[PDB]
């Protein structure tokens, strides 16, 4: 329902037994977690009052896990799973460590930000590649049921969320690296005056600056499922927390 | 009296590019030169050159 | 032509030279201003950090990404002279303070 192109029609059903969970921890900005640095400014011995988009102290988090193996449900692409991007979001991602032949692999869920998700408009896509993120703001053609296949142990699905014969028009495209042995990651995504700002952090510390994109439009929505036939709580106990 | 000032010239401009380089010289200086019958074509888009 | 995003970086990279001692204008990362520059050895800049601000909100230092050198920006002179004039004198006495 997100896109307007039919990628595949192999196994589509209506699984009505998926309810998001609520965490038990609260936001604590006393030590510095939850705040972010300025874009490209440095301050030395300064107590500064900053007016910006920050999470509320004492709130609660909610998970948006869409773990699937073979069958994809249509309710997973419908609200409340597809929330509204009003002012901004602060996300906390858990770094899953898979061990195959005595080596570490890191794979976590991705998020795509758009307005109408049509090829006539722009959309921002991030994606981890064995420890390398790729942020691309392009005119991608989203499908009705996007997904992602874990390239760590093996699966049965084919990752296909964009269909383009040639390279579309992009406004920003950049790759970044992080610590593959990290435990948790933090992200900030907000917008103001038609300018989108994103911040990432791989360790426990105030978030650092990534980029600032000038779009001119107003974004109102912002998580595709991760099709993986490897992580399951029977032999390899790993859970996806976002 | 009126404060006297000057008019500075020769301004400086700095900005970080948003797109990577096209890297056309790397492909133009390839060790493999195709025959005139092949005439391989390479397309570049969304890059700075 | 005159569309898309594949542009050229020849006009904006004509000189790319930073002077030290003269008063000039600067458009650094969207921040526009005018002043003088001075060379200094700074090691508090990080990978993503390129400017330096103070408590008041003004820019005091920066770092060039093309040569990895830090600079400090100082405001340029803008003063006023004092003229002491008599009743029917021909030329007053000038005083430049400080
Ligand atoms: C980012 O990495 C992907 C593969 O991981 C590659 O296809 C792409 O060209 C890279 N982008 C840049 C700007 O290096
Ligand atoms: C990654 O994190 C581990 C543990 O915190 C640390 O030992 C290692 O030096 C880090 N590597 C990098 C490149 O930050
Ligand atoms: C500046 O430092 C960066 C990172 O250390 C390096 O990649 C770049 O080549 C350096 N540039 C110069 C001109 O030394």
From Swiss-Prot, chain A:
Disulfide pairings = 7-143, 138-170, 150-228
What is the species of this protein? Answer: Human coronavirus HKU1 (isolate N5)
- The BetaCoV S1-NTD domain covers 1-242
Q: Which gene encodes it?
A: S
- How is this protein named in the record? Spike protein S1
Q: Where the shown chain sits in the full protein? A: 14 to 256 of 1351
**Where is this chain glycosylated?**
6, 16, 45, 101, 119, 158, 175, 179, 237
Biological function: Attaches the virion to the cell membrane by interacting with host receptor, initiating the infection.
Swiss-Prot record, chain C:
- Going by the entry's taxonomy, the superkingdom of the source organism is recorded as Viruses
Functional summary from the UniProt entry: Attaches the virion to the cell membrane by interacting with host receptor, initiating the infection.
List the protein's name.
Answer: Spike protein S1
Q: Which residues are glycosylated?
A: 68, 88
Native source organism of the sequence: Human coronavirus HKU1 (isolate N5)
Shown residues in whole-protein numbering: 597 to 694 of 1351
